[PDB]
Amino acid sequence: CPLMVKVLDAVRGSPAINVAMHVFRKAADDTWEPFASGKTSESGELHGLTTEEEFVEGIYKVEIDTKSYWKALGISPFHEHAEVVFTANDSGPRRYTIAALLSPYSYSTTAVVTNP
Amino acid sequence: CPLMVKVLDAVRGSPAINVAMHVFRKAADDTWEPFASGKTSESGELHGLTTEEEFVEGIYKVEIDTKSYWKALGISPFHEHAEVVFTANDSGPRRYTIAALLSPYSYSTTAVVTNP
Amino acid sequence: CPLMVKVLDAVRGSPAINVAMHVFRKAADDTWEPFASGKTSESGELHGLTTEEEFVEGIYKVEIDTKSYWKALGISPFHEHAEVVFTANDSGPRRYTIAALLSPYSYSTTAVVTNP
Amino acid sequence: CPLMVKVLDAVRGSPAINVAMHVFRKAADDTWEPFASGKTSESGELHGLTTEEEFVEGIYKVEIDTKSYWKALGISPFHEHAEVVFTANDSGPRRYTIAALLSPYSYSTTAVVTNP
Ligand SMILES: O=C(c1cc(O)cc(F)c1)c1cc(O)c(O)c([N+](=O)[O-])c1
Numbered sequence A, B, C, D: 001c002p003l004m005v006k007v008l009d010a011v012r013g014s015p016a017i018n019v020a021m022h023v024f025r026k027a028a029d030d031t032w033e034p035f036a037s038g039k040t041s042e043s044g045e046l047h048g049l050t051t052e053e054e055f056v057e058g059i060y061k062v063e064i065d066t067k068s069y070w071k072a073l074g075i076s077p078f079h080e081h082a083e084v085v086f087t088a089n090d091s092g093p094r095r096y097t098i099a100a101l102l103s104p105y106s107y108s109t110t111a112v113v114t115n116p
């Protein structure tokens, strides 16, 4: 698993379950092409988005659909989504964990990058 | 000032000065129209982006060039930029402050939405 | 104002108003001596805690009563309080702003340390 | 494992390894008694601090020695330590993950609380 995303709920102190997200890759013509998508599990984690062979050098965007998450809980949040944009595998393959901690009017995001 | 942006540096414990950003408004064809831009001041703040009459309801994106900020400090960053995508809502008067707290491999963002 | 505290509410997207806090200074016997206190204003800020001459180098603790804040909004919180423990340092002049961003099960805190 | 602590480094995008921390419990006379201590592993995690039988109702304090962590990396940080104070097991046994995301002048902390 070279790319894993973990989402936490700072209001309930729980994983953020069933959070949808889309991953895009910047194409040579500078547009965003669809790369992978999925939803977080009961642990707040989304695994298996890609493989080492498919996950080439590039600029990637993770768009986490935080608005739908909060709406289903009865909250009208500030953000449309949490957006994480980063260059990946510039110095060879790495393993990436992207984390997001969600509140209705705020979110934090961090990356843990490890060398296989 | 209906919309202000404040950027802070979590490594130096200081305003993040001379940080460039662009604000976009989502168009009917789901593309991002440039709307305003600028660079943070010595206080880390960017004022005067828009006016009350110009700032209508809609989806806005603030794209903060964090990568250039960290590269100018000689620190390798994770993100290409920090993105803040939100719906501006006109139920009551609203002044928006978008704040971002920057670290090389993480950022936090919050909205302080008040009434004069 | 050598020391100011600002508290924000990540659930409502607003200053955290009427938040009580106490500031302590570590004594020679490793106990916490009360030093100053107050409640945040309508802007979420607490000014006038100390003066330049009183605020000497040492270890300070800011104890923010986040639990009472959330209980007054009817929201069950995780933390008993938010603690910010830091060394005040006199190499150059220094103005300190302690900020805290509150969620029921999470908080962030940062220091913005500037020079007039 | 009813109590686990995870520490991340927001400057390097890595687990925070070999971070010491002490856990205290509030005694009936309102003083802090030592409860458990340890250091984070190569994954940034500290497991096995306590057991379900030992981890009774009470007010607990986790003091994470962030200052020693940053000093060893050549950074002079703002905080003496990160302090997490919370009531545990008030409604029966729970499993607690305490997380801390560290920067030199800022930290975030969150709790994930699950029912066994
Ligand atoms: O967003 C924040 C913020 C973000 C965090 O992750 C943690 C925290 F303690 C504050 C913020 C907002 C403001 O309006 C503001 O003035 C400041 N400040 O000056 O320090 C900060």
Ligand SMILES: O=C(c1cc(O)cc(F)c1)c1cc(O)c(O)c([N+](=O)[O-])c1
Binding pocket: A006, A008, A097, A099, A100, A101, A108, A109, A110, D006, D008, D097, D098, D099, D100, D101, D108, D109, D110, D111, D112
């Ligand atoms: O990024 C974080 C994170 C973000 C924050 O704003 C504050 C904080 F204390 C941790 C994180 C990453 C992980 O991999 C992870 O397991 C967890 N967790 O379990 O709680 C959290």
